[PDB]
Amino acid sequence: MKDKVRAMRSLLISDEFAGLKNAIDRFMLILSTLHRIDSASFSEATMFRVYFADNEQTLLASGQTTKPKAIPNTPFWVITNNNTSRKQQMVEQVMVRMGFPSDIIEKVTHSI
């Protein structure tokens, strides 16, 4: 887990992440990165209100105004009809389930 923590820390100080001025894109890059780091763990944590799916329609079936969006470089979709607080909670839920320690989770969610 220490190397996974290191990867999330590396994201937070990366040029790509720093350049993002909007919460939605930071949210998305965080999710993409979590999947990159451990796709199996990410899959379990997200497929476990429904926030995530492996297709757009499932999320539209949950609600027509959920504004589902594809998580880049993954097979997954996430609802985006939400504020930054809710985005933070979603990322926390995922990262807790994937086994991350709270310290890095706080830094990652605060960055959204």
Handedness of CA 49, 53, 58, 59 (dihedral sign): positive
CA-to-CA separations, 2 to 7, 99, 100, 103, 104, in angstroms, rounded:
9, 11, 9, 12, 10
* Chain centroid to CA 109: 10
Domains belonging to the chain, first-starting first, are 2-112 (1.20.1380.10)
Give, rounded to a whole angstrom, the gap between the first and last alpha carbons of the chain: 22
DSSP 53: E
Method: X-ray
